[PDB]
């Protein structure tokens, strides 16, 4: 719920293999299954 909107895409990985920004702020994304097609669950969560 506590998320902020941005535009630059300078992303990288941290030790936990989460795509974060320069400030170590975790990105959010949609959950789709390995066999799914379109978005399954619309609630965002960090990309692994």
């Amino acid at each position: 719920q506590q998320n902020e909107l941005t535009r630059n895409g300078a992303f990288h990985l941290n030790k936990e293999n989460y795509m974060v920004t320069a400030n170590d702020e975790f990105l959010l994304g949609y959950q789709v299954d390995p066999s799914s097609g379109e978005v399954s669950s619309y609630e965002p969560q960090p990309i692994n």
């Binding site: 990288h12 990985l13 941290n14 030790k15 936990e16 293999n17 170590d24």
Partner: protein, 49 residues
């Protein structure tokens, strides 16, 4: 004529290479954001050759 293997080179990969801290002489060390040093051989799994 004794052909014997003397060892093999160790290869180290960290999950977050951007987070490695910079020492002198083109050298780095592991830090808390760089992850833990993953010790592996070459040409195995995700490692290069």
């Amino acid at each position: 004529g004794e052909n014997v293997t003397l060892g093999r080179v160790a290869l180290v990969r960290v999950p977050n290479e951007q987070g490695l801290d910079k020492k002198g002489g083109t050298q780095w060390d592991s830090t808390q954001f760089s992850g833990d040093k993953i010790w592996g051989e070459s040409n195995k799994g995700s490692f290069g050759t």
